[PDB]
From Swiss-Prot:
Domain notes: The presence of a 'disulfide through disulfide knot' structurally defines this protein as a knottin.
Disulphide bond pairs: C4-C19, C11-C24, C18-C31
GO cellular component, one term: extracellular region
Highest taxon listed in the record's lineage: Eukaryota
Keyword ATP-binding: no
Task of the protein: Selectively inhibits activation of voltage-gated sodium channels (VGSC) (Nav1.5/SCN5A) in rat cardiac myocytes, followed by shifting activated voltage in a depolarizing direction. The binding site on VGSC is suggested to be site 4 located at the extracellular S3-S4 loop of the channel. Also binds to voltage-gated potassium channels (Kv2.1/KCNB1).
Recorded coiled-coil stretches: none
Keywords associated with the record: Disulfide bond, Ion channel impairing toxin, Knottin, Neurotoxin, Potassium channel impairing toxin, Secreted, Signal, Toxin, Voltage-gated potassium channel impairing toxin, Voltage-gated sodium channel impairing toxin
Full-sequence range covered: 28 to 63 of 63
Molecular function terms, GO-annotated: ion channel inhibitor activity; potassium channel regulator activity; sodium channel regulator activity; toxin activity
Record's protein name: Beta/kappa-theraphotoxin-Cg1a
Main location: secreted
Protein species of origin: Chilobrachys guangxiensis
Length: 36
């Protein structure tokens, strides 16, 4: 039961466990789906 964030949540270098398919970004300051 890994925790998941949302579509555009705020995160550091991947501290908060985002949802499957979502990636966090320290330069951006948030976590979202890795489309690009």
């Amino acid at each position: 039961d890994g925790e998941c964030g949302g579509f555009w949540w705020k995160c550091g270098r991947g501290k908060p466990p985002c949802c499957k398919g979502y990636a966090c970004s320290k330069t951006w300051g948030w976590c979202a789906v890795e489309a690009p």
